[PDB]
RNA sequence: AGCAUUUGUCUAAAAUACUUCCAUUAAUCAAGAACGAAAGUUAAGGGAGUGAAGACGAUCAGAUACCGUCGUAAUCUUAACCAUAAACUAUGCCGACUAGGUGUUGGAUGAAGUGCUUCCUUCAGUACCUUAUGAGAAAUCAAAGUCUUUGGGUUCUGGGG
RNA sequence: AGUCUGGUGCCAGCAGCCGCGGUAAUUCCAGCUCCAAUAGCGUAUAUUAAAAUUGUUGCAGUUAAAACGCUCGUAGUUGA
């Protein structure tokens, strides 16, 4: 109830850094004197729930593609993919994955899930020419072009990415028939990172 | 619409199209005059009529 | 003949789950499969099969230390004559190959035009529904609506393209240097393209839009 | 003949060969917070996405539909 | 010197399906490679055997790019399995 | 000097609609500009607008409906006789079934069809699509 | 155009601020006028260095040139004149509207470093970087955009070599 | 609408323009066939369209031609 919000608070999600982003200032709470930007997070939890509503409204999880070019978030997306059968892309992205019909590596998805718009920018840009909506875990210095749902998150830290994917996973599992919402989910929790 | 010169001249033109037979029974407004075509005018030639009636065996014979 | 669509959306058209090109146009879906066009514009069952025409073939040249390295660019114009035009462009180092490539490009290019009445309801959309202008390089070309029995005019190329679109009556105009033919063709195609993109009073009406083919046939798409 | 899609955000028309605009399906909830059968659909232009304004627009649209509480 | 793409590709195929047959020794690797792959020249076979042996040396010292061993995959899957004041101030500021 | 108040306002409205913001705050205000917005609202282009008081000159906040293709002015307001109107609309309008050419005639600012119905020329004022 | 030693004197200037005054005085402007680098002219100084002209030594096929050494007129000031320069933001000037960020110079507003100093917000200047389903022939241009979807105001200029 | 048949051979010559002609000429001189318009068709000169290439509608002036060196300013034009 509060506990999900509180865990999000305890993880370093609220730390925006250098430059607000003009557009994102409605999700920033205040500029800190220390040179870091505070993120609202209350709106983020509800927005994350909306992202879950859009994901559940995709009738098959395999047509939902996850992407990360961040080493530690590669492990996180892979964990996300294990729990709900979204296909993950890690390491070097290939532009033809959405644009080149005859390529070996091809994906014809309905949705894209992005770990950071600054790192995973090429895929996001290509996705707009291939008309895919793009939901995005976004940070203060990361661009907001061609994403439909923006979920504010400190994308720099391992814990923050893990927390978002863990919360997201629970919400989709709850929306799905897997587990009652009242019941807590506990299937190998907090095991989402590596060196 | 309803402009006095235009409706008079328009009724007069359509009446003339009726006199010529260039417009027949099923066509009766200024947009059918725009609908008129070069074959329709050519069909009005006497040689076409003579050939059609079968007084002669061909357009040239007509 | 023999067929195989690599894309899932292609397979749906091949089966006939998607009935016509209008639905894929509605959901604005990109096409890299010529077989989709081939299925929709088949010689029978279709009311108006496409007619192609190689509008302009030009040699263009790389030039080296040694030989010429002469390539062939090819422009082809395709139309149903009733609502769907296509302008297709390919450069290749052999003519027949260039001609084939341009035809495939034309199918990919294939776009629906809108037409209207010059005034009162005659039941036949016959002329452009408004003044539309298309630009490429120097040349900006404007199609402007004309009354009935007031046939299309222009350059040969313009005349063919409008005929391919099924535009019966038009006034045409042009601004710039008309000589550059590929740019001229492209500019006509750009102007022509705008006809079914232009917002109009008839479209003030708030109206529901259908769910995606990717959800209507989701099970069938999972299946094969 | 047919009627092309119009953007939910900007109330303006989306071309056939635009190839960037998207339809966002939003799942309705059950009272216990489970996925309902029915789903609300919205059309988002490639242009609004190109601007980067889609999240803001979505918020106003969700606010109108009563699917987000904070408006902005 | 170096080793060409054909040699490297053949070496990459090897290990992937055949690490459980591989060993440190080059002469035994020459036998294994001949047994496993129907390579048409001695020169080519010796080069593939050599590079596969070189990959063997690289292996155990560390993971190597462009190949996969199912025992390592299994091992990796197995292997992975209010607040204090300075933390507090942002939360308090939120309320 | 301030030049043509109507023109800059309409360009601003045009820019607002082109951009897709769909509301704008007009810094000038005048009786004719208000009437022109009322005429656009009359022809279904504009929703509600609020003119807010300031003693020097009010300001206007207009709600735009996602519906203007263009709005523009004929500058200066050239005189035009009744039968010359037919050529003017033919020149300007994108369609013969849509787009509106506005004049000021002795009975106020109104479109070309209204003026024709009247039978009066005027000064031609502006237009929108 | 152009303007860099020190201090003084005589002067102008813009922004900021203003619950100060006026009440449309304006904008751009044929005609006309002012100012207008460097060189040139004319006269007085002054005339060091530099140094059009000019003189030699070379260099070199020759070299009257680049290069070396010398060196008048000029460069400097006063007093008159002269009125052109790639006198180039090769972008007439005023007007509005458009998109962000990094800076930066001059003020005002708030807060915290130690009245002063810093930082925050905001103005008038001023550059850069990225973005232009904006423009353009592209280069590029936040103006060269908002211009066949062509009329914010106005001056000047061009019509193949 | 002809890589048609012979002759000339950077000559003779033709051809609004591009060009053709230095030996196998698809342009010259013949012959043949074909094509366009037709009791009319060539040729010159002048003129309109062509030319949104003089631009009220409706031009252009960073780099292609073209912003007065600069500012003030009377007539001028424009006027919250």
UniProtKB/Swiss-Prot annotation, chain A:
What do the Gene Ontology cellular component annotations say?
Answer: cytosolic small ribosomal subunit
What GO terms in the biological process aspect are recorded for it? cytoplasmic translation; ribosomal small subunit assembly; translation
The record's keywords, sorted A to Z, are: Cytoplasm, Ribonucleoprotein, Ribosomal protein
In alphabetical order, the GO MF annotations are: structural constituent of ribosome
Q: Has UniProt tagged this entry with the keyword rRNA processing? A: no
Q: Which residues cross the membrane?
A: none
Compartment list? Cytoplasm
The entry describes its oligomerization and partners as: Component of the small ribosomal subunit. Mature ribosomes consist of a small (40S) and a large (60S) subunit. The 40S subunit contains about 32 different proteins and 1 molecule of RNA (18S). The 60S subunit contains about 42 different proteins and 3 molecules of RNA (28S, 5.8S and 5S).
Concerning its family, UniProt says: Belongs to the universal ribosomal protein uS2 family.
What this chain does, per the entry, is described as:
Component of the ribosome, a large ribonucleoprotein complex responsible for the synthesis of proteins in the cell. The small ribosomal subunit (SSU) binds messenger RNAs (mRNAs) and translates the encoded message by selecting cognate aminoacyl-transfer RNA (tRNA) molecules. The large subunit (LSU) contains the ribosomal catalytic site termed the peptidyl transferase center (PTC), which catalyzes the formation of peptide bonds, thereby polymerizing the amino acids delivered by tRNAs into a polypeptide chain.
In its UniProt entry, what is this protein called? Small ribosomal subunit protein uS2
- What species was this sequence derived from? Plasmodium falciparum (isolate 3D7)
> What's the gene?
RPS2
């Amino acid at each position: 109830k509060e506990e999900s919000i509180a865990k999000m608070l305890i993880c370093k999600v609220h730390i925006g850094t250098k430059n607000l982003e003009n557009k994102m200032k409605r999700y920033v709470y205040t500029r800190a004197k220390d040179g870091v930007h505070i993120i609202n997070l209350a709106k983020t939890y509800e927005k994350l729930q909306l992202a879950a509503r859009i994901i559940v409204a995709i009738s098959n999880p395999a047509d939902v593609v996850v992407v990360s070019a961040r080493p530690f978030g590669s492990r996180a997306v892979l964990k996300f993919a294990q729990y709900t059968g979204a296909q993950a892309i890690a390491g070097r992205w290939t532009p033809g994955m959405l644009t080149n019909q005859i390529i070996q590596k091809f994906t014809e998805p309905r949705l894209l899930i992005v770990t950071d718009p600054r790192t995973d920018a090429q895929s996001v840009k290509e996705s707009a020419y291939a008309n895919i909506p793009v939901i995005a875990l976004c940070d203060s210095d990361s661009p907001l072009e061609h994403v439909d749902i923006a979920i504010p998150c400190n994308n720099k830290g391992k814990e923050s990415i893990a927390l978002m994917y863990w919360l997201l996973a629970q919400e989709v599992l709850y929306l799905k028939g897997v587990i009652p919402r009242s019941e807590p989910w506990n299937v190998m929790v907090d095991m989402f990172l590596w060196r | 619409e309803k402009s006095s010169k235009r409706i008079f001249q328009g009724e007069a033109l359509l009446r003339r199209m009726v006199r010529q037979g260039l417009l027949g029974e099923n066509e009766e407004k200024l947009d059918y005059v725009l609908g008129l075509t070069l074959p329709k005018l050519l069909e009005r030639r006497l040689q076409t009529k003579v050939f059609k009636l079968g007084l002669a065996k061909s357009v040239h014979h007509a | 003949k023999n067929w195989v669509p690599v894309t899932k959306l292609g397979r749906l058209v091949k089966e006939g789950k998607i009935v016509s090109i209008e639905e894929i146009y509605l959901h604005s879906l990109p096409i890299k499969e010529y077989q989709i066009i081939d299925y929709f514009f088949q010689p029978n069952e279709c009311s108006h099969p496409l007619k192609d025409d190689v509008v302009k073939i030009m040699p263009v040249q790389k030039q080296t230390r040694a030989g010429q390295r002469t390539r062939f660019k090819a422009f082809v114009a395709i139309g149903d004559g009733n609502g769907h035009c296509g302008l297709g462009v390919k450069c290749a180092k052999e003519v027949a190959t260039a001609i084939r490539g341009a035809i495939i490009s034309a199918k990919l290019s294939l776009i629906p035009v809108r037409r209207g009445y010059w005034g009162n309801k005659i039941g036949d959309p016959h002329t452009v529904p408004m003044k539309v202008s298309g630009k490429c390089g120097s040349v900006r070309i404007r199609l402007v609506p004309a009354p009935r029995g007031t046939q299309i005019v222009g350059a040969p190329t313009t005349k063919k393209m409008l005929n391919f679109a099924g535009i019966k009556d038009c006034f045409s105009s042009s601004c710039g240097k008309t000589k550059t033919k590929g740019n001229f063709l492209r500019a006509i195609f750009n102007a022509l393209s705008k006809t079914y993109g232009y917002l109009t009073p008839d479209l003030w009406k708030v109206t529901n839009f259908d769910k995606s083919p990717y959800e209507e046939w989701s099970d069938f798409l999972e299946t094969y | 003949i047919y009627i092309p899609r119009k953007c939910s955000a900007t109330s303006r028309l989306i071309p056939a060969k635009e190839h960037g605009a998207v339809q966002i399906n939003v799942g309705m909830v059950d009272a216990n917070g489970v996925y309902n059968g029915k789903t609300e659909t919205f059309a988002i232009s490639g242009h609004v996405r190109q601007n980067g304004e889609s999240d803001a627009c979505l918020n106003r649209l969700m606010y109108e539909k009563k699917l987000l509480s904070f408006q902005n | 010197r170096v080793r060409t793409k054909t040699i490297k590709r053949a070496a990459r195929q090897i290990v992937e399906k055949y690490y459980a047959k591989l060993t440190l020794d080059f002469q035994i690797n020459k036998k294994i490679t001949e047994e496993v792959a129907i390579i048409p020249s001695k020169r080519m076979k010796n080069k593939v055997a050599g590079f596969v042996t070189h990959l063997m040396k690289r292996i155990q010292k560390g993971p190597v790019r462009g190949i996969s061993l199912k025992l390592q995959e299994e091992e990796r899957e197995r292997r992975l399995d209010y607040v204090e004041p300075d933390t507090l101030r942002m939360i308090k500021s939120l309320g | 000097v301030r030049m043509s108040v109507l023109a800059d306002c309409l360009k601003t409205i045009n820019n607002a609609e082109k951009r897709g913001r769909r509301q704008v705050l007009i810094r000038p205000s005048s009786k004719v500009v208000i009437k022109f917005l009322q005429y656009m609202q009359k022809k279904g282009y504009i929703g509600s607008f609020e003119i807010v008081d300031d003693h020097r000159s009010g300001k206007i906040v207009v709600n735009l409906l996602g519906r203007i293709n263009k709005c523009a002015v004929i500058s200066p307001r050239y005189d035009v006789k009744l039968d010359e109107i037919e050529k003017i609309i033919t020149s300007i309008l994108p369609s013969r079934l849509f787009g509106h050419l506005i004049l000021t005639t002795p009975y106020g600012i109104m479109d070309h069809e209204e003026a024709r119905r009247k039978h009066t020329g005027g000064k031609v004022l502006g237009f929108f699509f």
